[PDB]
Write a protein that binds this ligand. Structure first.
Ligand SMILES: *C(=O)CCCC[C@@H]1SC[C@@H]2NC(=O)N[C@@H]21
Ligand SMILES: *C(=O)CCCC[C@@H]1SC[C@@H]2NC(=O)N[C@@H]21
Lengths: 684, 684, 90
């Protein structure tokens, strides 16, 4: 019995408009993407059976001894985050999940879990990550899944207590999550050791990712030399990981740097599998990927053709065709590739409301001097749009270079990238250059994020903080060193459950408790809106965004037990009250409800009205202009004396003092239109 | 049920316009007239008791014996056509009847029904005359009413069968009717004889009327001399009646003329009650009326103050005030006159959409040169407007005099007035002069009514009529001689009862049968229209003609206990075939109705499409502009022989005859861009 | 011809003046959350003044100088955009 709340949502969409902020105006494609047919038989068993049967190390050995190359479709997380603002719901994903299970059993592993998946499922979109994860894992019983995880902060942006992160990892593994990736913003050794230890405590296949920046083929700059990365890999390997992984956030891999680094690591690690992640922002990613594959790569990240290019991962087809005659022999059907690409482009056509292709058309070479992370460009563009700064977005990216170089050649990863982007925003809205910021570091009101980083909440940069700027900014601000996760006191996991179940909700589960501990207020708002509108996510994307149209019929699956349909009838009209009626016809009955519009009165005039109950109160006898008032406020007047004169074209009503006393205040000064019984002055 | 029909009517009124045509575009005023207060006790004793306890002769003697003056109110019949097109409903009428029946006892009689009363009560207004008359007798069991009748034609414009008129009068008298008027357009003595014979057969008060035209005080005016009128009056009085009357359809009585006339009449008949009827158009009506009422008159017609002036009768107020310090001593409390006038003034704005004021601003002179009947001018202007010649309406009345000379100086009230009007309509429509119209009147077709008059379906005029024009028009037509009514073959109506019954009659009353006998076409039309939408005259007049406005609640009655509470929300839009859905509110229920819009015509024609079932037919392969044609219609064609060339922008395709034979026709003009798959030509 | 039906007006919070160093303007456009100092109270150098939060950006306004506050132009619970006078120092 939530159809009432759902229709209230629909009517609120009809009147007040779509609720989620929209960066650019657009209209959804009326057409519906076509899903290809799927075989009746259960999906063929992929590599998940090995994990279910063999240990994580046994699985790693089986992959390593396998001849050929292993593939990852990263469309579900990295493309959505990068190309879009990853505002995709799970309905369309489920529409294709059986096809993927039935056809893509040769894939290495699947990425479905994001870092900002919680933020999008809470703040703007309204979904529970655990739920649709559960349905997807049901639909995919035979491909292992990979989730994104950071070093100290599990999904947050500040370092976090060890115990809560361990419990969260335990919960995720208990749910059925398969493969874990753990990394750090600056590759901070205590944080990465903590993450590796947490993943080992969870139990499963564990990898660590090395943040690659710059070019290792340039001997002029050895800020992070091949020796540096090699030693880093040395402590990672001695840490006992399953597989090493490499992530190219900005797609800055030359095939030369590819081959020399891959050889440099494979020579001393002959049985170590390889995982490669890159963003095809510059359009030359495919060459580097092919060079790595020739050089001894094992697993790589690559996106569907329709969702490829631009800033996402490269395409299926390029690598598939390039290795047909090549002994690499990716050995995957092209028909499934075409079906996947066509379905994905059809689905993208629906999310045309905020495609960044209007802003940026094709990937440029402006990454080698800008180093914008591939995954956050559209999101930061939309952040600027919310800030209204989209007009100068061309200068916004111009500021990023110096925003980073304020703090030096840092490892610009998602937290650091966000901080640098915030710094660029601040100095571009203030419009001051490098010298103005550096000389006035104390003077400028930097956000709490600047002092947060300079304090050392995330960690310590390998190169170290900028001492003069940090001294100018922090000054009296405390500086906590060491591992902040070790520095941060542990926090309770129990009394918060009681507090939340007292405030709302009358059931106990650890999932919502840990979610609210990670993020209380957005959790509360999400619960508020869901309660006011019942279950969601059972609708179509077009229905979710723009709502039903006039005299069109559409079936709505309320839940699995029953499915009904609603017929939108008419918009009715604005009432004198802010409520508006809207007409709706469900399966066999007609109904209409009241919708509040955001146009409640315009509040003009409301001139003071003299009250006749108080005989001392004076009201204007006739409406018109005032030629003059013979009395100033706080002046004594006598009974029957002229004190004010009203004006019209034929009569001149001279005001008479109602009694003896002094005038408090003259509401009318001179020459304003008056009404009958208007407050002029009060006499006592 | 019944609600559905009226609800559909309301929806149709919302979607479409008012069914009745609108002469002048306006809206009813948002004001309800004030009903004056009424007592509770039974109505006082008027004159219905007197005629009840006496005979018509005894009652007439009692009236004559009264010292003073007795007044006739024509605000229920004549003021209608004088000021409006006689569009007043009955629902508004049944709101002062208790007041006047209580307040007005000295009043002589009231005229409600009239000649042009039923021809609208079913044709434009949709009501039953007998029904409304039945609903007033109980409201006023105090004061006699008065019927206006014509001699030969009972209600119609052509002489009706004598039995028909007799039985009609008998039924009318049986309806409880009290006073009757006998009249004829011409002075055709058999017409008045038949009318008075029918009135006496019915049994009751019989009054005949004499038309007035020209001047009696002008020696030059000789066609209708005093002695002519004296002979008419003496013949009628020898026929023997109850009360005499005089008609002034145009308001042409000077005081001296009517006072000398009254002196002549009262001299030789100093017992007979004397009655006058005039239409105040020249503006001097009140003066002559009062003068030659002080002379010898007994009864005076008079209209309400608000419904006075212009062309209607003079007012209550002037006559009451003047007859104050006089022996006549009207003796009527004028306060009730005041409230009556106030109610009528309030009621006038309801039908303000059509009125003579918009055209006829003030009372115009020169009526002597025009002699246009007062009760005809408004309808004439309306019919000219509906004709489309309302623009040149002044030129229409200009041509009216020439038509008068065409027919000579004759008395015209109902039939011949509109006959001259239609002849002038033809005159102005053809834009032709009088003299040559007289000349080439042989071949020129004339309206059917002119032919009827020239044949003599009405009777012989007093002065005859020109022969050569009648020979030029009638020519070879049979011509009626003698009395048309006697020459008319009497016909039975008993078969009409069964015809009505078995066609659509299951409750038809003899009144309805008589109505069908009068105007069968519009009778059946009104019957079917009422049967479609149910009974009318149960709602407000603005509610009837304008309909309820959106988003307001209103109440409607059905009977004493059946009264509803109705509200309307809004209207849907044209869904798929010009149909609307509208949403009403019952006392507590919500209703949805469908209305078929009439403003959707969407007439579009296309070049014939080649049908694939016919192999011989040839269709256009590509849309585009035709360059040249190689085969003419009805010419032999070879198999695969070029016949047409098409080229739109890029492609050029030459159409060839796919089969051997000869063509029948080509649908090509060589110079039109024709779409593909079109029936360009055919093959045998 | 000069039209008469054109009425143009200006209102809402004014803009902080750059030459007046005592005038303190809003650095970012956002919602007023809390005000650290009430009008008529001494303010130290580098002291929090107001908190602004719009989408994820948290900003605390520091005191440009050391001196008592005279008027709270920022008021409370009304959105203020960048470069709007929030506090004035004499
Ligand atoms: C709140 O919407 C701001 C969205 C931008 C931050 C998100 S968080 C995780 C991603 N990593 C990054 O740098 N921006 C993205
Ligand atoms: C059309 O609805 C009927 C009214 C117009 C004819 C009436 S009949 C009596 C009057 N005399 C005349 O010529 N027209 C008027």
């Amino acid at each position: 019995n939530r159809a009432q709340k759902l229709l209230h949502y629909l009517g609120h969409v009809m009147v007040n408009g779509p609720t989620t902020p929209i960066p650019v105006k657009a209209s959804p494609s009326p057409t519906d993407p076509v899903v290809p047919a799927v075989p009746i038989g259960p999906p063929p068993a992929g590599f998940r059976d090995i994990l279910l049967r063999e240990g994580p190390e046994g699985f790693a050995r089986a992959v390593r001894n396998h001849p050929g190359l292993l593939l990852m479709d990263t469309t579900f997380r990295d493309a959505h985050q990068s190309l879009l603002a990853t505002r995709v719901r799970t309905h369309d994903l489920k529409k294709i999940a059986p096809y993927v299970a039935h056809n893509f059993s040769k894939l290495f592993s699947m990425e479905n879990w994001g870092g900002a998946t919680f933020d999008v499922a809470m703040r703007f979109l309204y979904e529970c990550p655990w739920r649709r994860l559960q349905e997807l894992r049901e639909l995919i019983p035979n491909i292992p899944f990979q989730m994104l995880l950071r070093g100290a902060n599990a999904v947050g942006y500040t370092n976090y207590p060890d115990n809560v992160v361990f419990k969260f990892c335990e919960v995720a593994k208990e749910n059925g999550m398969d493969v874990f990736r753990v990394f750090d913003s600056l590759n901070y050794l205590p944080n990465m050791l903590l993450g590796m230890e947490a993943a080992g405590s969870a139990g499963g296949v564990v990898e660590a990712a090395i943040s690659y920046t710059g070019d290792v083929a340039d001997p002029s700059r050895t800020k992070y030399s091949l020796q540096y990365y090699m030693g880093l890999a040395e402590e990672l390997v001695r840490a006992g990981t399953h597989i090493l992984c490499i992530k190219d956030m900005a797609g800055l891999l030359k095939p030369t740097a590819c081959t020399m680094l891959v050889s440099s690591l494979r020579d001393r690690f002959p049985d170590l599998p390889l995982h490669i992640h890159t963003h095809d922002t510059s359009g030359a990613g495919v060459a580097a990927m092919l060079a790595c594959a020739q050089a001894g790569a094992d697993v790589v990240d690559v996106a569907a053709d329709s969702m490829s290019g631009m800033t996402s991962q490269p395409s299926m087809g390029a690598l598939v065709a390039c290795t047909r005659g090549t002994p690499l022999d990716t050995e995957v059907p092209m028909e499934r590739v075409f079906d996947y690409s066509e379905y994905w482009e059809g689905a993208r056509g629906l999310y045309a409301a905020f495609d960044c292709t209007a802003t940026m058309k094709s990937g440029n070479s402006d990454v080698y001097e800008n180093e914008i992370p591939g995954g956050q460009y559209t999101n930061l563009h939309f952040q600027a749009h919310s800030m209204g700064l989209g007009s100068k977005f061309k200068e916004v990216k111009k500021a990023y270079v110096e925003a980073n170089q304020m703090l030096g050649d840092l490892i610009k990863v998602t937290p650091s990238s966000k901080i640098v982007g915030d710094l660029a925003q601040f100095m571009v809205q203030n419009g001051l250059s490098r010298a103005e910021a550096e000389a006035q570091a104390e003077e400028l009101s930097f956000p709490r994020s600047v002092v947060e980083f300079l304090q050392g909440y995330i960690g310590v940069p390998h190169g170290g903080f900028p001492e003069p700027f940090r001294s100018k900014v922090l000054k009296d601000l405390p500086r906590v060193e060491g591992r902040p996760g070790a520095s941060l006191p542990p926090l309770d996991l129990q009394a918060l459950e009681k507090e939340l179940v007292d405030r709302h909700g009358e059931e106990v589960t650890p999932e919502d408790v840990l979610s609210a501990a990670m993020y209380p207020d957005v959790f509360a708002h999400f619960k508020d809106f869901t309660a006011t509108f019942g279950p969601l996510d059972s609708l179509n994307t077009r229905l979710f965004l723009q709502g039903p149209k006039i005299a069109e019929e559409f079936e709505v699956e309320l839940e699995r037990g029953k499915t009904l349909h609603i017929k939108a009838l008419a918009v009715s009209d604005l009432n004198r009250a802010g409520q508006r009626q809207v007409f709706f016809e469900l399966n066999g009955q007609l109904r209409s409800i009241l919708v509040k519009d955001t146009q409640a009165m315009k509040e003009m005039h409301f001139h003071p009205k003299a009250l006749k109950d108080v005989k001392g109160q004076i009201g204007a006898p006739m409406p018109g202009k005032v030629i003059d008032i013979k009395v100033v406020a706080g002046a004594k007047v006598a009974k029957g004396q002229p004190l004010c004169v009203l004006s019209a074209m034929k009569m001149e009503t001279v005001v008479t003092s109602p009694m003896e006393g002094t005038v408090r205040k003259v509401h009318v000064t001179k020459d304003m239109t008056l009404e009958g019984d208007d407050l002029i002055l009060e006499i006592e």
